[PDB]
Amino acid sequence: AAEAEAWMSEQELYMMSEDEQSAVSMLKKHQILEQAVEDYAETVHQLSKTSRALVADSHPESERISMRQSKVDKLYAGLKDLAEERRGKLDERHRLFQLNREVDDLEQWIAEREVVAGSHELGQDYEHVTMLQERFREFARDTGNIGQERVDTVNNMADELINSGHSDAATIAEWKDGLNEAWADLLELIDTRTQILAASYELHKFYHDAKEIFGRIQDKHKKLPEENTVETLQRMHTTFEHDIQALGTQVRQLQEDAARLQAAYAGDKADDIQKRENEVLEAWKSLLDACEGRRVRLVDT
Amino acid sequence: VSSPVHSGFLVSFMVDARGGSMRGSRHHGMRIIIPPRKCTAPTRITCRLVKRHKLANPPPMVEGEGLASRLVEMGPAGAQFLGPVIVEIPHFGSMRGKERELIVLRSENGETWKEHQFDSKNEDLSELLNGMDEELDSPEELGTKRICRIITKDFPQYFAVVSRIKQESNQILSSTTVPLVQASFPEGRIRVGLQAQPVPEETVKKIKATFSPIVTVEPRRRKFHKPITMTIPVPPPSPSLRLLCSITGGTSPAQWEDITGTTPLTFIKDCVSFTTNVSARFWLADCHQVLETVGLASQLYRELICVPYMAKFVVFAKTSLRCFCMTDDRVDKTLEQQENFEEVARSKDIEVLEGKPIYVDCYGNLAPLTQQLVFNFYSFKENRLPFSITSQEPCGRLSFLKEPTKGLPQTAVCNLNITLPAHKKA
């Protein structure tokens, strides 16, 4: 019994001391000591019963004995209490570290997707930028869905620790701000990449549309030389007039696109847009002269 | 028929030629103005303040210098604009009324740092009739508002806002902060500057000896062709007069030695004129005990290099008390709003020193159980103070002072009156 106090004091020394792997083992050891403390409890209960020795009513040290057994009871009960106090503190470290891994995993994920949306690949041709835009829009849809699942999960997990009353939950909250900041940075990056694609697609469409209209305008001009009068007059009014009305609407619609685009650009890029638009208009007007003489128009329009 | 844009951005935004006045919704006061017809393509501009990681080789600040704001990452690494554009970034560096200045550093790639110079400033033409316009009221309005304006024709990778003791420079020099400081170098070719540092009596007393303004020439450890005459004011008396000198280069911490023997100390009306062939920090220390001076000077020099920061004090509460000293930190702190605190006390911006502890005192209200309690102010960090806390009014007033004393009264730095909520017993 006298040694048992020293034996308990040795445990008292081990229990008082200051990555996920360290904490998980830390608690693994500490669980064994608590089970060992229960073994001391078996020793203390009988030792207390033996120390009592009331029936014998011996008095050599009875006053001293009643104090040693009581000190032993205080020694063990306090020791058991201390074992529980550390167990919670160690569990906090494991839970804290376990959650940190996830926050870093999510933070790594955003760095990955950020790289994807960081990519300022404008596109080789109109056929390309269409794939880019119609793919990236799916990538944004997916990221935006699953990303929010995980950030909500980690916030739920982190909210549980802080709401639980963590002794370290000042850096848990710091981590929460850090993650949610970086998350809302990705979504915002995603959007400005989506916009940047739409703008490229709008210009690419104008450039591609310019080639087609210019080709069509001049191509239909070549057909004019081949081109009795009753048959030609009906042929022009019925089909040819409608054909140009359609072609002119395309030129005007292209012209609208030129202007819309013209707001958003400036300098050399703006100059090239004006060059192609002027290119289309010159060919268009050139066709209008040659075509004017042999053209039938209705009185109404 | 179309008009420039105007919106709030966290870190990034798209801008075309039409225009863009963009306020940083994250960091209040952070504004970027792109005039119309200024950028040619549609472009993604990013204005970020670095906190996730430490950049390699951050800007080379000499001793006593310190970053006003954090470091800003620009969006397009080498973006070019035909016209000039405005990037306005809030800082928290106290200038002590023309005593200090702000140097603007830029890194083009991320390796090397140099200073950003702008050719000229014409507000009307650069704005180019921008609808938002509203360039802040005056340079004085900028100074009161703690907003650093950078005018630029192109973005570098990184911009840096640095706070330093003001330097008078040219391409016969003298200080614009302390009059009686002069360096006489024969005229006729490169640029060199001279900075004069003020010294306060109260701060000197806290840590037997008297001291002059620290005279410094920015390009230190440089040997001129011929010796240069130096004129320095004479500190009041307490041979007792001594001249201190430091030749440590660049970022390296200063080293002080006594050069009284190597220096003919001519006198010209409350001044000391002398010669020196080498560019270095110079200081006059007047005290009779000669051996003590350098060590005592070191005790002062360590104090002097500390940089000032316009910080706000904030006091949260819950039925218990949290005291924050913050500079750009998120107001309505997330941990508190989570733990059901409330913002019972705000403060006006008051100058405090980084790395220097500020002591907390409560007058007329409950005290902590505790051994007085204290925290230091680290710039751009969240400085958190927890608190374990008659029956008429719960009002109380608490003060924040640099000095610990009850022997004599020391003037306070901040004084926040506070009132509790009494939701439930604690």
Same domain, B283 and B413: no
Q: Confirm whether B424 is domain-assigned.
A: no
3-state DSSP: chain A helix, strand, coil percent, rounded to 5?
A: 85, 0, 15
Same domain, B161 and B196: no
Alpha-carbon distance values, B158 to B8, B71, B193, B328, B380 (Å): 21, 7, 25, 19, 18
- Under a CB-based contact definition with an 8 Å cutoff, are residues B86 and B126 in contact? yes
CB pairs under 8 A between A and B: 69
Same domain, B178 and B156: no
Same domain, B129 and B145: yes
With CB atoms and an 8 Å threshold, state whether B52 touches A189.
Answer: no
- Under a CB-based contact definition with an 8 Å cutoff, are residues B211 and B298 in contact? no
The beta-carbon neighbor of A188 closest among B12, B334, B335 is B12
Residue type at A3 in one-letter notation: E
The Cα–Cα gap between B218 and B371 comes to 45
Instruction: Name the residue in chain A with its Cα closest to that of B11.
Output: A185
3-state DSSP: chain B helix, strand, coil percent, rounded to 5?
A: 10, 40, 50
Same domain, B173 and B156: no
Same domain, B183 and B250: yes
Residue type at B275 in one-letter notation: T
The Cα–Cα gap between B126 and B396 comes to 52
The beta-carbon neighbor of B17 closest among A120, A163, A266 is A266
Instruction: Name the residue in chain B with its Cα closest to that of A120.
Output: B44
Query: Residue A114, SS3?
Result: helix
Beta bridge partners of B90: B147
Number of Cβ within 10 Å of residue A46's Cβ equals 10
Tokens of A229: 């009068």
Q: For residues B31-52, b (16+ Cβ closer than 10 Å) or e, as one string? A: bbbbbbbbbbbbbbbbbbbeee
Question: Breaks in chain A at C–N > 2.5 Å: after which residues?
Answer: 18, 227
With CB atoms and an 8 Å threshold, state whether A120 touches B44.
Answer: yes
The Cα–Cα gap between A37 and A83 comes to 8
Tokens of B243: 């001249």
Q: Which residues of A are less than 8 Å from B17 in CB distance?
A: 263-266, 270
Which residues neighbour A239 within 8 Å (Cβ) at sequence distance 6 or greater?
Answer: none
Tokens of A122: 């404008």
Q: Confirm whether B425 is domain-assigned.
A: no
Describe the crossing of helices A268-292 and A171-223 by its angle, rounded to 10 degrees.
Answer: 30
The Cα–Cα gap between A240 and A262 comes to 32
Tell me which DSSP letter residue A168 carries: T
Q: In what order do the strands lie in the sheet with B43-49?
A: B12-15, B43-49, B66-74, B158-165, B100-107, B113-115
Phi, psi of A177 (to 5 degrees): -50, -45
Number of Cβ within 10 Å of residue B259's Cβ equals 15
Min CA distance, B227 vs chain A (Å)?
A: 55
With CB atoms and an 8 Å threshold, state whether A173 touches B338.
Answer: yes
With CB atoms and an 8 Å threshold, state whether B42 touches A199.
Answer: yes
Q: Confirm whether B65 is domain-assigned.
A: yes
What torsion, rounded to 10 degrees, do the Cα atoms A43, A46, A51, A52 define? 150
- Residue of A265, A271, A272 to mutate for B, most B C-beta atoms under 10 A: A265
Min CA distance, B416 vs chain A (Å)?
A: 24
Query: Residue B172, SS3?
Result: coil
Phi, psi of B307 (to 5 degrees): -100, 140
Same domain, B280 and B324: no
Tokens of B65: 């210098």
- Does B18 contact chain A (CB < 8 Å)? yes
Q: Confirm whether B390 is domain-assigned.
A: yes
CATH architecture, domain defined by A1-301: Up-down Bundle (1.20)
Alpha-carbon distance values, B222 to A289, B65, B129, B167, B188 (Å): 79, 20, 48, 17, 17
- Does B52 contact chain A (CB < 8 Å)? yes
Question: Which domain range does residue B361 map to?
Answer: 308-419
Which residues neighbour B421 within 8 Å (Cβ) at sequence distance 6 or greater?
Answer: B317, B319, B342, B344
Element (H, E) at A89: helix A62-118
- Does A270 contact chain B (CB < 8 Å)? yes
- Under a CB-based contact definition with an 8 Å cutoff, are residues A270 and A292 in contact? no
Q: Confirm whether B89 is domain-assigned.
A: yes
- Under a CB-based contact definition with an 8 Å cutoff, are residues B205 and B184 in contact? no
User: What beta strand segments (E) does B337-410 contain?
Assistant: 342-345, 350-353, 357-363, 374-376, 383-387, 396-401
Which domain-ending residue is among B127, B149, B165? B165
Displacement of CA B170 from its chain's centroid (Å) = 23
Same domain, B294 and B340: no
Which domain-ending residue is among B257, B286, B305? B305
Same domain, B33 and B109: yes
Q: Which residues of A are less than 8 Å from B323 in CB distance?
A: none
Q: Which residues of A are less than 8 Å from B339 in CB distance?
A: 162
Q: Which residue has the tokens 């310190």?
A: B66
CATH code of the domain containing B178: 2.60.220.30
With CB atoms and an 8 Å threshold, state whether A267 touches B9.
Answer: no
Same domain, B23 and B70: yes
Same domain, B412 and B315: yes
Q: Which residue has the tokens 């009068």?
A: A229
CATH code of the domain containing B325: 2.60.40.2660
Number of domains chain B is built from: 3
- Under a CB-based contact definition with an 8 Å cutoff, are residues B356 and B306 in contact? yes
Q: Confirm whether B140 is domain-assigned.
A: yes
Same domain, B377 and B319: yes
The Cα–Cα gap between B158 and A239 comes to 64
Q: Which residues of A are less than 8 Å from B330 in CB distance?
A: 177
The Cα–Cα gap between B354 and B61 comes to 16
Alpha-carbon distance values, B166 to B115, B197, B305, B310 (Å): 15, 8, 14, 18
Q: Which residues of A are less than 8 Å from B52 in CB distance?
A: 178, 182
The beta-carbon neighbor of A173 closest among B13, B82, B334 is B334
- Residue of A172, A192, A272 to mutate for B, most B C-beta atoms under 10 A: A192
- Does A65 contact chain B (CB < 8 Å)? no
How does strand B12-15 pair with strand B43-49? antiparallel
Which domain-ending residue is among B120, B145, B165? B165
In chain A, domain spans: 1-301
The beta-carbon neighbor of A267 closest among B16, B82, B338 is B82
With CB atoms and an 8 Å threshold, state whether B330 touches A264.
Answer: no
The beta-carbon neighbor of B10 closest among A188, A199, A265 is A188
Q: For residues A159-180, b (16+ Cβ closer than 10 Å) or e, as one string? A: eebbeeebeebeebbebbeebe
Min CA distance, A207 vs chain B (Å)?
A: 15
- Does A156 contact chain B (CB < 8 Å)? no
